[PDB]
Nucleic acid binder design. Sequence first.
RNA 1: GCCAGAACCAGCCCUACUGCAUUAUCCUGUCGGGGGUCAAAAUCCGGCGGGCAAGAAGUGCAAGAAGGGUCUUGGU
RNA 2: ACCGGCCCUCCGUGGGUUGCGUUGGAGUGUGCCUGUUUGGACCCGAAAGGUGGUGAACUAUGCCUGAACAAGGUGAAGCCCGGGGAAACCCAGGUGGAGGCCUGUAGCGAUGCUGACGUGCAAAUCGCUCGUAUGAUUUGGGUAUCGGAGCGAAAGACUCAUCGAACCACCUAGUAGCUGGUUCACAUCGAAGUUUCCCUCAGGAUAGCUGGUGCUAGUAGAAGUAUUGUGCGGUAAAGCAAAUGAUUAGAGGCAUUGGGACCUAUUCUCAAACUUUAAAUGUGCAAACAAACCGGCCUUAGCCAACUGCAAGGCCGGAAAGAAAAGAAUUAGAGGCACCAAGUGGGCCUUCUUCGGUAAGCGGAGCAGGCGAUGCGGAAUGAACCGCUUAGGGAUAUGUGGCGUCAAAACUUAUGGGCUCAUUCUCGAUACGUAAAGGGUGUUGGUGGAUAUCCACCGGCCCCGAAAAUGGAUGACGCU
RNA 3: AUGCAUCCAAGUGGUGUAUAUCGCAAACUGAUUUCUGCCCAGUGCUCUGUGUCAACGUGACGAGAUUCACCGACGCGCGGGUAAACGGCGGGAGUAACUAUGACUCUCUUAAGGUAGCCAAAUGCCUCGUCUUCCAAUUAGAGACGCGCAUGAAUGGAUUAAUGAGAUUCCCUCUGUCCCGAGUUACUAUCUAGCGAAACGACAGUCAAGGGAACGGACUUGAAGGGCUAAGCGGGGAA
RNA 4: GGGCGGCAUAUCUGUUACACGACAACGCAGGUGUCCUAAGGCGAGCUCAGUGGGAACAGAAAUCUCACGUAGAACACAAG
RNA 5: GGAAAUAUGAACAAAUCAUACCAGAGGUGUCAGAAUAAUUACCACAGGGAUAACUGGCUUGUGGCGGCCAAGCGUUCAUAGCGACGUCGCUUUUUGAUCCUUCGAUGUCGGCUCUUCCUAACCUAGCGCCGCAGAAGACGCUAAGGGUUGGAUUGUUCACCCACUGACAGGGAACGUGAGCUGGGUUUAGACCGUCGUGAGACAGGUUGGUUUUACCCUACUUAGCUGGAAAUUGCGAGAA
RNA 6: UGUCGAACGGCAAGUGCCCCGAAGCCAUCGCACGGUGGUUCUCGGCUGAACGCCUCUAAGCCAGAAGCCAAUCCCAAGACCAGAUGCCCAC
RNA 7: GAGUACGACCAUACUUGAGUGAAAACACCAUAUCCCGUCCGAUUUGUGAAGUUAAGCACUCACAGGCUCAGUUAGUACUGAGGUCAGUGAUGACUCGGGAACCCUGAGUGCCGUACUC
Length: 190
Amino acid sequence: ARRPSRCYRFCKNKPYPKSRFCRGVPDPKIRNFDIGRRRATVDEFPVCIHVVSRELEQIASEALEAARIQANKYMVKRANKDVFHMRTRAHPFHVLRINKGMRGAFGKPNGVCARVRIGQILLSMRTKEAYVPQAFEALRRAKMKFPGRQIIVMSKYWGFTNILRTEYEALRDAGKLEQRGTHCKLIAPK
RNA sequence: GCCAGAACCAGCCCUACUGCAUUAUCCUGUCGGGGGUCAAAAUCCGGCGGGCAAGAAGUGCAAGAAGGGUCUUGGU
RNA sequence: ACCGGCCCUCCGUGGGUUGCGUUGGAGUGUGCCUGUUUGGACCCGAAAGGUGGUGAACUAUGCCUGAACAAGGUGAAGCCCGGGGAAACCCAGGUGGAGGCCUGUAGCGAUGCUGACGUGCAAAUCGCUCGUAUGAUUUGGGUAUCGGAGCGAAAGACUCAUCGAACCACCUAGUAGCUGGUUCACAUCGAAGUUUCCCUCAGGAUAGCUGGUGCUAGUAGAAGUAUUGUGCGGUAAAGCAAAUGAUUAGAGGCAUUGGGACCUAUUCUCAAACUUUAAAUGUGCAAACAAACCGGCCUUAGCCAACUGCAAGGCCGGAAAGAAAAGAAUUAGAGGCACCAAGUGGGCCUUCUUCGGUAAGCGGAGCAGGCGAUGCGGAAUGAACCGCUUAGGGAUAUGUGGCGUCAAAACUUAUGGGCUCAUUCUCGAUACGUAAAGGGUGUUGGUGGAUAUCCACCGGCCCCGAAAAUGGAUGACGCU
RNA sequence: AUGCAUCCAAGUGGUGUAUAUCGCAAACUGAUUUCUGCCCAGUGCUCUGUGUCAACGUGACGAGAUUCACCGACGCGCGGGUAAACGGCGGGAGUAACUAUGACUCUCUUAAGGUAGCCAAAUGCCUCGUCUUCCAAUUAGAGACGCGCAUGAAUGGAUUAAUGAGAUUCCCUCUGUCCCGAGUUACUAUCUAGCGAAACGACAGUCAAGGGAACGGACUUGAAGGGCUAAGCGGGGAA
RNA sequence: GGGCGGCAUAUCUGUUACACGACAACGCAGGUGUCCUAAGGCGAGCUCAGUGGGAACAGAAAUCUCACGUAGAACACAAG
RNA sequence: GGAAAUAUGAACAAAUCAUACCAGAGGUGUCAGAAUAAUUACCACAGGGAUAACUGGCUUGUGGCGGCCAAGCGUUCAUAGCGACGUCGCUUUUUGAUCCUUCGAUGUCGGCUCUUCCUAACCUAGCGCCGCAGAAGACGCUAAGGGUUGGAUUGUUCACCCACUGACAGGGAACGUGAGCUGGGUUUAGACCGUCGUGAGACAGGUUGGUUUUACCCUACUUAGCUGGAAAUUGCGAGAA
RNA sequence: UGUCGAACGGCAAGUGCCCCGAAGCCAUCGCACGGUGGUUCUCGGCUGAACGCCUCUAAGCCAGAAGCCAAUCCCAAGACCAGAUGCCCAC
RNA sequence: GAGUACGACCAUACUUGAGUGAAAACACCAUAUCCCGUCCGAUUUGUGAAGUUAAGCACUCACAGGCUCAGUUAGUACUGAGGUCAGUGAUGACUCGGGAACCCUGAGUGCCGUACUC
Ligand SMILES: NC[C@@H]1O[C@H](O[C@H]2[C@@H](O)[C@H](O[C@@H]3[C@@H](O)[C@H](N)C[C@H](N)[C@H]3O[C@H]3O[C@H](CO)[C@@H](O)[C@H](O)[C@H]3N)O[C@@H]2CO)[C@H](N)[C@@H](O)[C@@H]1O
Ligand SMILES: NC[C@@H]1O[C@H](O[C@H]2[C@@H](O)[C@H](O[C@@H]3[C@@H](O)[C@H](N)C[C@H](N)[C@H]3O[C@H]3O[C@H](CO)[C@@H](O)[C@H](O)[C@H]3N)O[C@@H]2CO)[C@H](N)[C@@H](O)[C@@H]1O
Ligand SMILES: NC[C@@H]1O[C@H](O[C@H]2[C@@H](O)[C@H](O[C@@H]3[C@@H](O)[C@H](N)C[C@H](N)[C@H]3O[C@H]3O[C@H](CO)[C@@H](O)[C@H](O)[C@H]3N)O[C@@H]2CO)[C@H](N)[C@@H](O)[C@@H]1O
Ligand SMILES: [Mg+2]
Ligand SMILES: [Mg+2]
Ligand SMILES: [Mg+2]
Ligand SMILES: [Mg+2]
């Protein structure tokens, strides 16, 4: 039985990653950071729905999996597996310790958490404009696996790109837009 | 050389009596366009004609040489 | 420059030093306080160590000579008679009185009640029960063995209520960095829990803070502050599209390969021990009176090929907003020395930064301020919070906090606006200061959509979530 | 005995020794019965005598002191003996015609690898071992089995009749131990006459909550409280 | 708490450490008691790590050659 | 005796020998530098709450008890009853951590006795709801008024079975309660065993034997007496349910 | 059993012992007795809107737990009773 | 308007790829008897002067990479002082001050000194 998340919710220490100094750190519980059609293109899924953190806290890697194993569930239950793409924009890079205030008290690594901030995006699921209301409900359920307070906002940008939903058309049709991968870059003069 | 009361000096502490500037996104006058009403006055917006809203403003600064205290000091 | 020591040398009108040296003496005797030191050493206090004597009337053991041990049971050897047998020998009835034998008095012990008593009858006793009671038995008198020794059927037991080293006197008022105590008043000043070293960590010495004495030409060689000029920095932030360390993912480069390697541009996400860049807060120096500034002169075995240049120490003369104007400083700003010596060297709390920890009224740091050591006015109460800091008193006015009663003040103020209803720890209510996720067609505002009605969101108060051991707490009553 | 152990400051000193190996002195174990296994490497003792070990003695250099050289015994070195001296007495891996099991084999290591026995024993961590018995039910008891944390042979092993104020368990009788208490007696307490202390004692003495050196008799806010007595009693006074 | 354990008992680089300096903990990450007649001193010449194109035996790796190569090498050692 | 020859052994002089002055080396790792093994359960002294073992405090990892989300379980189905992955918490009957209070002493376990409290309700009173036909029962609500046993083994809290019952709920009060008891157990001195130690001895290993002292004081509580006082003693201070 | 010489009467043995024993005390070891009203929680409802219908709730009502509060029961005026009374005194 | 030698700052000067280059000078270039040094006349040393601007050098040109400089990001991040501020808290705003960084965008792409020379 692991120690509860009540013990590690607050950013009380400096960031303590895996380096050439701390070398017994376990494998974090989240391994897949993208669910859905990650092979897909930019103009496949226009809309973007975020899960933004309203707290300065540490989310454990055990909660990043629990929020992602369950957001995948309600999507394939109430849609297909080929309409969404939920990127998890938090990575467990800070390593927690356990003393398993006494002589020789500096702990050993047992778990890894994500030091998240105010306004830092936690989840991001780009979907189609048809199947939007199934995505507000998959992300309402996924933030229950999260500590702290989160909001589910509607992003004004076209998917995972840095270009607006107002100003995406006549920018691929003006030809000025470099679509590489899952993101875009406005071509400028060199 | 005790206890009270008033009086009057001086000192000090209170509170009455107020001027200089400032108004304008404002005052007033009528023709509009707007309103509502039984009809129409108003709220509201706009033309150019006048302006001082005059213990008029709760806006800036105030220097206006007293009636009351003084078992809140000293004196005769 | 000279004196002494030690040297170097190019041998000097030369270098380097060292002394508790010299450069027109400051000693010395005494009185008195202070401090260090040693003596009983401010007072009282160990466990101990040593010397020499007294004890075997308690009790441990040996020896000499005396004394003591009811009444029962069991019944050993030997002895007598009978019987069986060929013999070897067996079998029976008595007799007898053996034993570290048995029951049980006295005596000698002391098992259980964990009885009584437990400021007793008693510094070990009383009661009943129990062990033994012809033996390694009990006991008198006499004798013999003792203090690092005696004696011990051995328990470190006993040696005159004293024993894992007796008792007496002494050395000895042993020594204590440890505990306790330390006797009049007022006045003037007033700390430290930190540094370094220590067989040091409950102690010291040392520097600091502190007092006393002063000395020296009362603004001087001043400053926990600014301003202007000129230096130093790598923390916060930023970045990973820049090196290093991590770390997701898609895009194809096509021949660069094997059952994403590889390459090129991007990307999601990070770094106390990473960094291109880089703050705020800090930190160094300068800002005209022994000083720099301006034009010659003297000197030097300094430098340079040389001096007319350079470097150095003087000399002579000059100028000097005594530092302008540009926001262009301010000062309850006498500067500089020295002697002597206390107490302290357990700290603790807090805003902020921070480390270990799940956490802690936890442990450890940084800058400052506090308590310690300090009340007073407030937070009902509280070392540390808020206000304020303190001679003995008045008057006025405040601060923090208050104005329904307790309790001074709105004798429950306004001729201000909203919000709130809560039915067994009972809505709520003075910061520090000790319930959450989540939910509500309770009410009250907002935002964005739609056809007077719906829909998604967000806020305020209120309710649910919300369960402990004396009766109970916004401080009490109460207040709507 | 020209001794052994030993007193002893000392001597022609003292004890066992008034003795004389059927004795005296020093140890161990603990009646009988039955046995007492292996280990002499370690550490002790002990025995037979050429490395090294002091003083003395010897010789030499030198003016001599000082040096140097040689000789130099016990004792350790070297070799034996000794366990009823102190003590000690192993680890892996495979193997039988069903499985298991392992007579069997292999390997490593030792001074020797624990023999006869005994056992969850007063010695067993796991452990309230497992099996059987005893009870309606037993972490207890007895008998077993031993994979013995860590049993084991005069550091004595095993066993035993008789004996024990020894430790344990069951059964019978028995009962106020209990269900569940009652009632009587003597002596107290209690009341009087006479007599008359001690322990103790800052001051004192009602509580709830709050705070506080984080369990208040005193402080804060509440709740009680007329004074003074006699017998009790054991919650507080961190008595 | 003391004991065992350890060394935080003399000492070095990074970090903690809060952009001067100074700053604690049985705080974090590692070192130290040695080593060298050259691994010291100096002068000259040279360029390293690595990758790419090539050359009998000869391959991913032997050695020759060329190019690129701000140090990605090296400087006895821990680190800077 | 100087610019220049090292100096002393103090009545002198020579030669030996020692010494001195200068610069190193041989070493103190506890590194500003004494030359150091245990044991004590036979124990002592001065102290320390500067510091441990018992309670109290803080914390709550750990131990107990929940809610929120809903992948799943339930033939069907998220929630009758459950509910992973997460997550937010309550609790102080566990334990750890700490070291605040006590070392010129707070008697350190469990029984026995007795009273009270709390609710997170086992039985009893009303209920709602079920994958509730009845009968038994799951879950929940208001409620702590009342009740909650007899035993075998164990020193036990605990555990474990036997049996009765409507039911044999869980806790608090200095782990309630030793001038209330008991003393089984921990927790001395004796002795035995095993393992350890060369030994003296050691042992959160087993075994056996091992003084439980004081109330007459203040309060509290239980009963038992006496006796004033409305300005709660006085003012004469005048209030009639 | 001892002892007043024996009988009689007794006495001693901390009440010698044995049997029966009044009275008193006492046993779940016997016997008798142990009662009413409301309030309102959960809850189920009634009217009834907000919200032209619906709805236990928002106003308002109903029924209602071994809880709670009274009645009964026990102490009782320091709860200071001009509650009532008997008899004396004093105004 | 340029060269060469010594240079100061040390990319606005570097890197890559093209283009152009009067004179003179630098430079490739020729060579090995001496001086000298190599496995090698490659480098290096000496001695030269037939050849060529092919290359170095110089200059010019890239919606070049870089570098440099403003601007933007942005009064944003962060931070000094304050509160009986708000919030269960995490933290946030306010008040008095200071005030970034990358991305991005624009610009231009060496400059000054001595001696000798065309
Ligand atoms: N010298 C006298 C002898 O006594 C003899 O008398 C003896 C016999 O009669 C008889 O002897 C008996 C006998 O009965 C029988 N057969 C044999 C038995 N052993 C004997 O028994 C004898 O000896 C035994 C010992 O064993 C004893 O115990 C006992 O005293 C005695 N009776 O007992 C007598 C001994 O006491 C004869 N008369 C005879 O031979 C002769 O006279
Ligand atoms: N010790 C070495 C010599 O022995 C000698 O004495 C020796 C003998 O003379 C003497 O032995 C004699 C014995 O022989 C003769 N029969 C009579 C005498 N009683 C013994 O003496 C004995 O008695 C007493 C015990 O009380 C012991 O102390 C002693 O040792 C013992 N040996 O015992 C000694 C043995 O060593 C001398 N005393 C003297 O020279 C020296 O001591
Ligand atoms: N003489 C010795 C010989 O070896 C044998 O000795 C054997 C055992 O005694 C001994 O083994 C041990 C022993 O060391 C230890 N001390 C006791 C243990 N119980 C024995 O265990 C032996 O006995 C038990 C029970 O009988 C068996 O179940 C077991 O299998 C066996 N190993 O080692 C040997 C292994 O079997 C015989 N006992 C003996 O009869 C034979 O003669
Ligand atoms: Mg007998
Ligand atoms: Mg002993
Ligand atoms: Mg103060
Ligand atoms: Mg006996």
